[PDB]
Design a binder for these strands. Structure first.
Ligand SMILES: [Zn+2]
Lengths: 42, 783
RNA sequence: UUGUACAGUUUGAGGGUAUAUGAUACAACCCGGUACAGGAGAUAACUGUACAGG
């Protein structure tokens, strides 16, 4: 339904995912620094 | 460094930084070092002070309820602390509310005059019986800090020769005689003895006591503070009303006493940023220290100055002004002082770890006062040892008062205010504490653990059942009666022990005493002996140790055990020739004399022998006979049965002591011992004709009901009734000779309840007409 | 017995069901084409906790 809070994966859910933490981001942003609510394309 | 981020890849260590930031926002941090028990520990939580192994474990911990509620409490505390000082209108409203409360429930000058009139009337009534005594008002009556409902406490001082119990009993007698006081009663077993009365015209409960030290001085100190500083009294009355609404002033339910808050009401003034009430002890006087503060103590007050004395453990006496001699005393309104008081007690002071004292500015550490850090502690100025806030000993009650303080501070930090129980408690209900059992849940008045409350009528006694009771009593006497050969063996054992002891300490003489020579000798009972030295500052401990060492040499004696913690140190061992326990004491002449008295009491009639033997077997069956277990010794039970026999419609046995004085060890040992002509000097001899079984059933009935242990002492010395108060004692039994030794002093409450239950069960089994054996039914542990 | 609070198992009640057009004999979920986020599972008995007892 949604990407894991850690690793940004899709195989497991937020609670299901338990692997070590990974950089926060979304595949749409494509970069760690950029944030969805403020992107160049918008 | 438990772990280093250099290992992680750039994206990896960046994500690890984000994870650490998130954990930090939840009050979870890293570990500088790890314990040997948990080498895998890598995190910790400050709120719970809890170690954590890994990041997954940390994320698991936050999900729990512990951290959630801790963070909620932290948020509430932050909200409380963020509030700024109150605005002038709000503080004026609070002051008006305090004024209204004091006017409605506070004391007035008319009340003080009326109480003075009560005291004068009591003085006039008491002149004919206690002309030299002088009465004064203390506590709430004289302090003005209490409520009009609060009782009238009157202390009567007497010449040093007179004794407190005697003066108080005489006061009760005069109160009973007079008609101005109705409902005269005595509560002599409270914290301080009191006589409670209710004057007819006044209707105000008055408690009369005497010799109340540390109370008159304390109330006069509070009165001086109130007179000199008018701002104190409104705060004290408001705080007392708050305590009453929160239901913590009464110490019966485990709360703090009512007047304690007064000591606290001044305290926050003392510890405030500007001390309104100056301290009375400190480094001002020469040779002062915190360790010496205990010796330092307030002595008296007069002419607006407190005089205090210091005695080294040279004497230093000095007077200090009660109030600061400063013209710039701040004009803080009462409401501001009240709000600052609430803030001080909530989120600005350590109630748990600091002692509330008004003598020294620097907060005395609980360790210096050798007090626990679990709960509140209030220091009374005129009694250093006492911790006046000890009535609260249950953590739930502490949490309740803390919640009351928190809610009232939040409420107190067209504005209108009011003192209400619901607002302060916020729906929480108190937690009554049983002061009698030290437990929680049941009030003293109704509680499962009340032996006195422990009844149904007995069935009628048929002649056959009475005959059966007499037969079983005689059977017990015969079964437990030592034979002649047993007496000869005991004499030989005593002689052998004396001879063996003489080897190391020549001249030693041994005399048998106790069950062996007191007329009531139990089969297989302990052999009690007393050792003396011919022609002889002797240390009981060293002598007992030497005797035990000597006995250890003997092959026959094994498991030698010297005991010195007891009042009379003794050597207890096992003799193979007797095959029984043997106890040896040193210079226990008083024991021999009391045993001889009991022997005479047995010799007068055989009914006494039968009764004592049946009592001993009944006690042994219930597992209360042995003294080492903490229960009353068999001597206490034989004393009880003798006392019962003496005090009965037909007097079975007379008081030998009552019917020249010889002082050995410091007490009189006289008692009529010529039984042969006893009837001549005794006018009631032969009046008793009840059967042994009937007499024993009467004994059980008398002790189960028709007797009081709290208000009477089981003493065989006096035919007349004796009262516990006159002995200043608070089951209690007095020796026939020594009046300062109580056999029930070491008896715990639980064992007393069990003993009363055993007596009730014995009364139930006996006296009920109706087992494989007749004897067994009357003596059965299960029933 | 006493004041307290959570480690595995079950039922009853919860958050979720937004981002889809066709299917699937009683033998078969499918190409999600747009919802926005710094957010990570609550209640009762099943004998395992860490503080106070006296
Ligand atoms: Zn994932």
């Amino acid at each position: 339904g949604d990407r894991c809070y850690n690793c940004g994966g899709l195989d497991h859910h937020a609670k299901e995912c338990k692997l070590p933490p990974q950089p926060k981001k979304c595949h749409f942003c494509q970069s760690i620094s950029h944030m969805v609510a403020s992107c160049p394309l918008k | 460094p438990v772990i280093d981020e250099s290992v992680l890849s750039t994206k990896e260590l960046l994500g690890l930084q984000q994870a650490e930031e998130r954990l930090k926002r939840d009050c979870i941090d890293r570990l500088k070092r790890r314990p040997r028990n948990y080498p895998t520990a890598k995190y910790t939580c400050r709120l719970c002070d809890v170690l954590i192994e890994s990041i997954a474990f940390a994320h698991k911990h936050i999900k729990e309820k512990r951290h959630k509620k801790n963070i909620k409490e932290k948020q509430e505390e932050e909200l409380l602390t963020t509030l700024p000082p109150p605005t002038p209108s709000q503080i004026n409203a609070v002051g008006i509310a305090i004024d209204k409360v004091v006017q409605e429930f506070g004391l007035h000058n008319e009340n003080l005059e009326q109480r003075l009139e009560i005291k004068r009337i009591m003085e006039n009534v008491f002149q004919h019986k206690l002309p030299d005594c002088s009465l004064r008002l203390y506590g709430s009556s004289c302090s003005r800090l209490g409520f009009k409902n609060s009782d009238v406490n009157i202390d009567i001082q007497f010449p040093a020769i007179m004794s407190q119990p005697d003066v108080l009993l005489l006061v009760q007698e005069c109160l009973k005689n007079s008609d101005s006081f109705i409902d005269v009663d005595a509560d002599f077993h409270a914290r301080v003895p009191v006589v409670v009365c209710r004057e007819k015209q006044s209707g105000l409960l008055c408690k009369v006591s005497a010799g109340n030290e540390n109370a008159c001085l304390t109330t006069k100190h509070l009165t001086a503070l109130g007179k000199l500083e008018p701002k104190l009294v409104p705060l004290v009355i408001a705080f007392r009303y708050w305590a009453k609404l929160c239901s913590i002033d009464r110490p019966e339910e485990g709360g703090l006493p009512p007047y304690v808050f007064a000591l606290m009401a001044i305290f926050f003034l003392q510890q405030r940023k500007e001390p309104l009430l100056p301290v009375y002890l400190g480094s001002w006087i020469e040779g002062f220290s915190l360790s010496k503060l205990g010796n330092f103590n307030l002595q008296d007050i007069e002419k607006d100055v407190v005089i205090w004395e210091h005695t080294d453990s040279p004497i230093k006496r000095g007077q200090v002004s009660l109030i600061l001699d400063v013209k710039h005393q701040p004009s803080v309104p009462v409401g501001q002082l009240w709000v600052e008081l609430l803030r001080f007690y909530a989120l600005e002071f350590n109630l748990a770890d600091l002692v509330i004292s008004i003598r020294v500015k620097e907060l005395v550490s609980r360790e210096l006062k050798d007090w626990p850090k679990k709960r509140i502690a209030i220091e009374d100025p005129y009694s250093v040892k006492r911790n006046v806030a000890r009535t609260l000993n249950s953590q739930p009650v502490f949490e309740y008062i803390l919640h009351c303080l928190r809610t009232t501070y939040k409420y107190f930090a067209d504005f209108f205010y009011e003192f209400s129980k619901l607002i302060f408690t916020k729906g929480k209900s108190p937690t009554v504490v049983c002061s009698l059992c030290k437990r929680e849940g049941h009030l003293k008045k109704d509680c499962p653990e009340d032996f006195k409350r422990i009844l149904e009528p007995l069935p009628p006694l048929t002649p056959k059942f009475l005959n059966i009771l007499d037969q079983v009593c005689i059977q017990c006497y015969k079964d437990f009666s030592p034979t002649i050969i047993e007496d000869q063996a005991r004499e030989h054992i005593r002689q052998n022990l004396e001879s063996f002891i003489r080897q190391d300490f020549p001249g030693t003489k041994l005399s048998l005493f106790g069950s062996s020579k007191n007329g009531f000798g139990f089969k297989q009972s302990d052999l009690d002996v007393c050792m003396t030295i011919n022609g002889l500052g002797l240390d009981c401990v060293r002598t007992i140790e030497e005797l035990a060492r000597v006995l250890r040499k003997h092959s026959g004696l094994r498991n030698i055990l010297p005991i010195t913690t007891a009042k009379v140190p003794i050597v207890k061992f096992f003799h193979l020739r007797s095959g029984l326990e043997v106890d040896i004491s040193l210079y226990n002449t008083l024991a021999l004399h009391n045993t001889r008295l009991l022997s005479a009491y047995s010799a007068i009639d055989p009914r006494v022998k039968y009764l004592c033997y049946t009592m001993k077997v009944f006690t042994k069956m219930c597992d209360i006979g042995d003294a080492s277990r903490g229960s009353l010794s068999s001597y206490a039970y034989t004393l009880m049965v003798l006392y019962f026999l003496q005090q009965r419609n037909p007097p079975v046995i007379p008081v030998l002591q009552e019917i020249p004085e010889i002082f050995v060890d410091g007490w009189n040992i006289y008692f009529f011992d010529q039984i042969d002509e006893l009837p001549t000097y005794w006018s009631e001899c032969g009046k008793n004709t009840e059967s042994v079984g009937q007499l024993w059933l009467g004994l059980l009935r008398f002790y189960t009901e028709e007797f009081d242990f709290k208000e009477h002492v089981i003493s065989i010395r006096r035919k007349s009734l004796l009262t516990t108060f006159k002995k200043q004692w608070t089951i209690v039994i007095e020796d026939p000779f020594d009046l300062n030794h109580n056999l029930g002093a070491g008896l715990s409450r639980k064992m007393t309840n069990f003993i009363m239950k055993a007596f009730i069960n014995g009364r139930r089994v006996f006296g009920i007409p109706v087992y494989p054996s007749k004897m067994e039914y009357f003596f059965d542990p299960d029933v």
